[PDB]
């Protein structure tokens, strides 16, 4: 009557079940990490250009999430205050990327800089609203 072996195997099995359920939940809520890769493009000084590119699973939601994550994780508003804009491609469906590596234009781009050069962001975002952070 190895009661402890039963307890240990049930315990392990429940941790396996919970680990797999957390894997499902975490990959579902953090799916843009797997499907979208950020593409930076320095413009001049501190400003860069953001967009994400993947397959069909990198939708507009994934691009937006990737861009805002890069904005809020690569710039420190405590050191210096930053400035950015999000520009949407309205000639594009929410799901628009293909499998193969010839993908066209992104659904979202962003220009991000520090307030030390805010005129460049202002003249680089044509007439899109600029968010301060």
């Amino acid at each position: 009557p190895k009661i402890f072996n039963l307890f240990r195997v049930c315990f392990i099995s429940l941790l396996l079940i919970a680990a797999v359920e957390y894997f499902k939940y975490g990959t579902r809520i953090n799916y843009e990490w797997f499907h979208c890769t950020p593409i930076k493009e320095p413009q001049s000084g501190s400003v860069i250009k953001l967009w994400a590119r993947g397959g069909p699973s990198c939708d507009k939601r994934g691009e937006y999430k990737t861009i805002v994550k890069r904005i809020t994780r690569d710039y420190e508003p405590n050191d210096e205050h930053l400035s950015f804009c999000i520009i949407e491609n309205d000639n594009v469906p929410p799901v628009h990327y293909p499998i193969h590596e010839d993908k066209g234009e992104p659904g979202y781009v962003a220009y991000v800089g520090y307030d030390t050069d805010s005129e460049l962001v202002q003249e680089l975002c044509a007439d899109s609203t600029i968010y301060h952070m």
Binding site: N5, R28, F34, P56
Partner: protein
């Protein structure tokens, strides 16, 4: 009544699970709301009904249901075995220890499989999977919801096999029986059931339930006819070997070939973590490895069956 309970629980091992089941059912049914708003409903019944249609979702009340019916199958095994088979296997002239224990086990297997085989065939009859069609096994993949009967069948099979595994772990018998690959087979079975349910591959798993169940029924019937020393046992063994070959090997090679071919061709094959589309190039090796492990274990048993046929045809 401590000594009386100890003696009863020694003699009748089903009294404690019967008390648990009786208590839970009486508490649930002697009440008001018997619907999902009761706390005992997640144990007694399947939960996550999508609106008022016939399609159920998944959650943690699935674990609660599986656990409660592990308790139920623990009760049923002992109660049925003792109360029914004792009289039946004693009024039949079987005089031994090994003979009585194995006729016990194979008659219980005959009962359970006779219940669960036609059940599975009825579940596969009221869908497009009818007659082991392997395309309806992949067309509408993500399958977050299952019908009522399909879900209760699936989860009852899961509870039965989980109870078998925990009995195998919590030993109450001489383990040494000369067939150890059974532990690996039980591990593979629980992994298949659980991953099949969790990753929305239940339509893919139903044919395997059917094929393993019918083979188990015929094999147990043949071994019982052997135990009774009937002389009609060889006809049953031939029927069993033909049905085993077909239903296990032909159908499961068909399913394994279906993986390789129509896993990539039917339905969605672009991975999507947001939409929970796991049918992709990554999970194809996992699916193939699990079913191939099951089929290797079955091929071993086919070798044993051919060995016994050999002995029977030169001795």
């Amino acid at each position: 009544i401590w000594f009386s309970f100890r003696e009863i629980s020694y003699r009748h091992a089903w009294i404690a699970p019967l008390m648990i089941l009786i208590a839970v059912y009486s508490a649930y049914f002697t009440s008001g709301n018997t619907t999902k708003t009761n706390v005992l409903h997640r144990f007694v019944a399947v939960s996550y009904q999508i609106g008022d249609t016939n399609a159920y979702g998944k959650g943690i009340n699935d674990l609660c249901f599986v656990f409660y019916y592990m308790i139920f199958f623990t009760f049923l095994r002992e109660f049925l075995m003792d109360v029914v088979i004792r009289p039946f296997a004693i009024r039949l002239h079987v005089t031994s220890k090994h003979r009585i224990k194995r006729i016990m086990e194979q008659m219980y297997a005959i009962f359970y499989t006779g219940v669960s085989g036609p059940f599975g065939i009825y579940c596969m009859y009221h869908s497009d999977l009818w007659f082991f069609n392997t395309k309806a096994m992949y067309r509408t993949y993500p399958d977050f919801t299952n019908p009522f009967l399909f879900k209760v069948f699936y989860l009852g099979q899961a509870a039965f096999w989980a109870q078998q595994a925990c009995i195998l772990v919590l030993q109450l018998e001489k383990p040494r029986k000369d067939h150890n690959e059974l532990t690996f087979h039980h591990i593979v079975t629980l992994l298949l059931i659980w991953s099949s349910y969790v990753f929305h591959f239940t339509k893919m798993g139903l044919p395997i339930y059917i094929t393993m169940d019918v083979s188990d029924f015929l094999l147990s019937f043949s071994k019982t006819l052997n135990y009774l020393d009937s002389g009609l046992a060889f006809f049953s063994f031939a029927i069993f070997v033909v049905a085993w070959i077909y239903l296990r090997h032909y159908i499961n090679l068909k399913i394994l070939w279906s993986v390789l071919t129509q896993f990539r061709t039917e339905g969605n094959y672009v991975l999507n973590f947001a939409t929970q589309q796991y049918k992709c190039w990554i999970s194809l090796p996992i699916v193939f490895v699990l079913i191939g492990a099951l089929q290797l274990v079955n091929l071993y048993w086919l070798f044993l069956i051919f060995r016994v046929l050999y002995r029977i045809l030169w001795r």
